[PDB]
Design a protein around this ligand. Structure first.
Ligand code: SZ2
Length: 480
């Protein structure tokens, strides 16, 4: 790592200087480091150049705006200070070159959209690893090789992807936030593929701004959900993009690449997905629950087919795809009710989780849930009303009551129902889960909402050992 080589594409006469790490933060800038002095909202890092220098950085690259000409080389206290115009726009490319272009040294798939990025990225990482990749994720749950995810600037993005390349990753599925894209945080990444899940003359400006942004990126293969109105508008303008549909939105007149679910059977342990595609037809046994997870899986499949992974190998490994832990996570047992563990802890998330569960439910849908104590009370009646409408049996119990009188929380929930008398109340969460699971019929579905992956019940100040997954697994005669 050398200032001269680093800047060779832009500043021909930059001085030779060994460089350790690249940092935007003058406070951690250490001996031998490259300090990058950027102007943001309020903040001007050029202010902290003297401090960086005094802490012994080998060199500084700085915003040229109002101070200098693009590629102007100064020298302060023996330290080279090189000025660049539009540093925020160019920071991805600078960090890419610094970290040896990590997106050129693995297959990077970007996933964008309002919902399904976490699931779609986890399915991409899992499926590619089943076919022999060493796969990683970068996103909301964190960064890391599959199974070792550790819970943000253009520099941090390149540095983290370099770290994954260093650990042997050959494939990375990356959640791309709308805000990340607009702030040029992935501006110089070589995406092998770009996946659109869904969105939500204003619409004219919004679209113009996004089209310009994406015209500037290396998107690779575009994989677009054609069931989304905005998805279709972009497929209209991208003849090489892959159309993915589970609601009959493939227009065969276009002769583009396509993949569509022809029929879906939502059953007690998953979904049987029959599909047709320009690669061939097939049937997948998904162990994931709900319509949105069919969409997410079909997007992962279309992407991997577009990248050249053979259909027969993808079909052969589909049954090993797993849910995101505690996200619509199914537990089934010989002649026991189907039980789904989901983290849903808001009115909207509860409604979606119940609507998803219902598709798989031939009998009665049960909803076991509560609301957190010493937190906003507003959601309590709203989650009551949702459980009453979208389930057949509401079991209201405790969920981290903390210092709040547990029954007061249950009262607030019941107050949102038309017929509170129809709700089952049971305190002890473990007892309420047992009550549902032991009373439910064989073709009933019990949704245990609010905790998902969390392994604790906060009663008072005590963080007690408790897992919904473990309680459910133990009651069904299976292993969490
Ligand atoms: C050339 C290419 C592009 C482009 N390619 O794909 C995308 C998006 C599609 C949805 C998935 C996210 C990327 N935009 C835009 C303008 N000019």
């Amino acid at each position: 790592r050398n200032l001269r080589d680093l800047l060779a594409p832009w500043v021909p006469d930059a001085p030779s200087r060994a460089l350790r790490e690249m940092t935007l933060d003058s406070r951690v800038a250490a001996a031998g480091d490259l300090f990058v002095a950027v102007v943001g909202h309020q903040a001007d890092g050029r202010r902290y150049i003297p401090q960086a220098i005094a802490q012994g950085v080998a060199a500084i690259i700085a915003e040229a705006k109002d101070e200098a000409t693009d590629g102007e080389i100064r020298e302060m206290h023996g330290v080279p200070v090189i000025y660049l115009s539009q540093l925020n726009e160019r920071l991805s490319a600078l960090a890419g070159r610094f970290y040896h272009e990590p997106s050129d040294n693995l297959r990077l798939v970007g996933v964008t959209g309002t919902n399904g990025k976490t699931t779609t990225t986890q399915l991409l990482a899992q499926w590619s690893q089943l076919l022999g990749e060493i796969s990683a994720v970068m996103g909301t749950v964190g960064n890391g090789l599959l199974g070792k995810v550790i819970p943000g600037s253009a520099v941090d993005v390149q540095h983290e992807l370099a770290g994954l390349v260093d650990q042997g990753a050959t494939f990375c599925a990356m959640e791309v936030s709308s805000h990340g894209l607009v702030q040029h945080r992935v501006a110089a990444l070589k995406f092998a593929a770009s996946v659109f899940t869904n969105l939500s003359g204003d619409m004219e400006h919004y679209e113009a701004a996004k089209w310009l942004l994406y015209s500037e990126h290396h998107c690779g293969q575009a994989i677009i959900n054609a069931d989304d109105e905005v998805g279709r508008r972009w497929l209209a303008k991208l003849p090489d993009a892959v159309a993915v549909s589970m609601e009959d939105h493939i227009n065969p007149n276009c002769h583009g690449r396509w993949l569509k679910a022809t029929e879906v059977n939502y059953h007690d342990s998953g979904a049987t997905i029959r599909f047709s595609s320009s690669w061939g037809d097939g049937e997948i046994e998904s162990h994931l629950m709900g319509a949105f997870n069919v969409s997410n899986l079909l997007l992962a499949l279309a992407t991997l087919l577009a990248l050249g992974y053979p259909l027969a190998d993808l079909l052969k490994t589909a049954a090993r795809l797993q849910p995101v832990c505690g996200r619509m996570e199914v537990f089934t047992a010989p002649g026991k009710p189907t039980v789904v563990v989901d983290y849903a802890h808001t009115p909207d998330a509860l409604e979606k989780a119940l609507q998803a569960a219902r598709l798989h439910c031939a009998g009665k849908l049960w909803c076991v849930f509560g609301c957190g104590g010493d937190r906003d009370k507003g959601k309590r009646p709203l989650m009551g009303a949702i459980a009453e409408e979208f389930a057949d049996v509401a079991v209201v119990t405790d969920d981290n009551p903390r210092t709040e009188e547990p029954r007061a929380i249950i009262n607030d929930i019941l107050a949102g129902m038309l017929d509170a008398g129809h709700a089952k109340v049971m305190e002890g969460r473990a007892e309420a889960v047992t009550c549902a699971v032991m009373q439910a019929k064989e073709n009933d579905v019990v949704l245990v909402a609010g905790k998902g992956h969390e392994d604790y019940q906060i009663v008072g100040n005590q963080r007690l050992d408790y897992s919904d997954r473990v309680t459910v697994a133990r009651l069904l005669g299976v292993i969490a």
